[PDB]
From a paper:
During DNA replication, nucleosome disassembly and reassembly occurs at the replication fork, and histone chaperons CAF-1 and ASF1 are principally responsible for the deposition of histones H3 and H4 onto replicated DNA. ASF1 binds a heterodimeric histone H3-H4 complex through its conserved N-terminal domain (aa 1–155) and impedes the formation of the (H3-H4)2 tetramer both inside the nucleus and in the cytoplasm. In vitro studies showed that an N-terminal of human MCM2 (aa 63–154) binds histone H3 directly through a conserved motif. The principal functions of histone chaperones are to keep the histones in their pre-depositional, DNA-free state.
The N-terminal domain of human MCM2 (aa 63–154), the globular domain of ASF1a (aa 1–157) and full-length human histones H3 and H4 were expressed in E. coli. We then crystallized and solved a 3.5-Å structure of the quaternary complex, and the structure was solved by molecular replacement. The H3-H4 heterodimer is centrally located in the quaternary complex, enclosed on one side by MCM2 and the opposite side by ASF1. MCM2 is composed of an N-terminal tail followed by a short helix (α1), which is connected to a C-terminal helix (α2) via a long loop. The extensive interaction between MCM2 and H3-H4 buries a total surface area of 1918 Å2. The long loop snakes through the convex surface of the H3-H4 dimer, accounting for ~2/3 of the interaction surface area with H3-H4. Interesting differences occur at the C-terminal end of ASF1 where 11 residues (aa 154–164) are disordered in our structure. This segment of ASF1 would bump into α2 of MCM2 if it took the conformation of that in the ternary ASF1-H3-H4 complex. Finally, although scarce, direct interactions between MCM2 and ASF1 are observed in the quaternary complex: the guanidine group of Arg118 of MCM2 forms a hydrogen bond with the hydroxyl group of Asn152 of ASF1; and weaker interactions between Gln104 and Asn152 of ASF1 and Arg118 and Glu111 of MCM2, respectively. Therefore, MCM2 appears to have a chaperoning function outside the context of a helicase complex, which functions exclusively in the nucleus.
Numbering used by the authors:
A (entry chain K): 26 to 101
B (entry chain J): 51 to 134
C (entry chain L): 68 to 123
D (entry chain I): 2 to 154
């Protein structure tokens, strides 16, 4: 999964509020995002097939993201 | 009053991300096109998902009175969100 | 201890690279044509087919 | 989403470690419910394995009238014997999960800070954790509310 880089991981962590990272964070973050992307894509692509299309829409992804589960910090 | 200067933010680079999407999507279904807004939605998802994951890792560290975050704090962040 | 994430070189990570900072044309849609959104029936037909794998 | 949790309130917090968990759950129902809602309270003993998670209680609710309902969930404290020493003192999680037809639609998680309330014990904690001097502090205003889109039939 060479798409995501060490600089990228750092950028994400800094917006997260992080101050220091273990060396093992880079290998770990990659594994996590590999799973996350494989899952959302797999579903979005199935959605595209079931609509009899070969062009993936934002709504295909929007629907696949509702399936994976979205989190919020607090209630509504 | 204080005025803010505006600027796009940089988490993950776009072109590498698009190539990553193509890689994975190829294994599920060959000869398959993406709308730009779809790939972007996929990126926005990943980026906010990982940023939130790190926010948990940050909060775990501050209360546990640590400086360095560990893969275990990511594992916890993943757990509280449902995945095994 | 681990890797420090703030200091001399913070700006090194946030340099603009216009050659990577934009999406490639290839792999994307050809035109801006209208494209059908899934009907509620196809949405369900999909979600059932997806629950299939989950089981194995 | 046919059932939607509006709120969860943490009742005795902070508290002694051994104190039973007290939550006040407010959920909303768009129509009457054919099946039962199952609420689980789960204490994650260790981030390393699911083996160490302790289901502290499980409650079955039904039949459910339409509208805003409110109840108080109270589970006993986890067994300190099953908690890996490394994780005992410091940050861990409690989960409140609800399932419909055995499908989880909502997970409300809380980060839990276990810490000794004495300076001397903080300066030098014991090799084996002393649970009777531990304070349990659920980080209540920082919940991780995750919603999943499931089949409602």
């Amino acid at each position: 999964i060479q798409g995501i880089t060490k600089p990228a991981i750092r950028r994400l962590a800094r917006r997260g509020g992080v101050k220091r990272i273990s060396g093992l964070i880079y290998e770990e973050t990659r594994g996590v995002l590999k799973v996350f992307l494989e899952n959302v894509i797999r579903d979005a692509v199935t959605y595209t097939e079931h609509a009899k299309r070969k062009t993936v829409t934002a709504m295909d992804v929007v629907y696949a993201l509702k399936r994976q589960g979205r989190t919020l910090y607090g209630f509504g | 009053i204080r005025r803010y200067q505006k600027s796009t933010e940089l988490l993950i680079r776009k072109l590498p991300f698009q190539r990553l999407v193509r890689e994975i999507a190829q294994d599920f279904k060959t000869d398959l096109r993406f709308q730009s807004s779809a790939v972007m939605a996929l990126q926005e998802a990943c980026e906010a998902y990982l940023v939130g994951l790190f926010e948990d890792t940050n909060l775990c560290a501050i209360h546990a009175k640590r400086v360095t975050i560990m893969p275990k704090d990511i594992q916890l962040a993943r757990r509280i969100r449902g995945e095994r | 201890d681990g890797e420090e994430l703030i200091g001399d070189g913070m700006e090194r990570d946030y340099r603009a690279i216009p050659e990577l900072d934009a999406y490639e044309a290839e792999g994307l849609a050809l035109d801006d044509e209208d494209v059908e959104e899934l009907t509620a029936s196809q949405r369900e037909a999909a979600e059932r087919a997806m629950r299939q794998r989950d089981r194995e | 989403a046919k059932v939607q949790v509006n709120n969860v309130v943490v009742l005795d917090n902070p508290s002694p470690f051994y104190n039973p968990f007290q939550f006040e759950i407010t959920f909303e129902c768009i129509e009457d419910l054919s099946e039962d809602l199952e609420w689980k309270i789960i204490y994650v003993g260790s981030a390393e394995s699911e083996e160490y998670d302790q289901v502290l209680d499980s409650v079955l609710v039904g039949p459910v009238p339409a509208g805003r309902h409110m109840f108080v969930f109270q589970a006993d404290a986890p067994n300190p014997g099953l908690i890996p020493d490394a994780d005992a003192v410091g940050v861990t999680v409690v989960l409140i999960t609800c399932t419909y037809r055995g499908q989880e639609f909502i997970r409300v998680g809380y980060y839990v800070n276990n810490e000794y309330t004495e300076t001397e014990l903080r300066e030098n904690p014991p090799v084996k954790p002393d649970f009777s001097k531990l304070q349990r502090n659920i980080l209540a205003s920082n919940p991780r509310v995750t919603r999943f889109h499931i089949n409602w039939e």
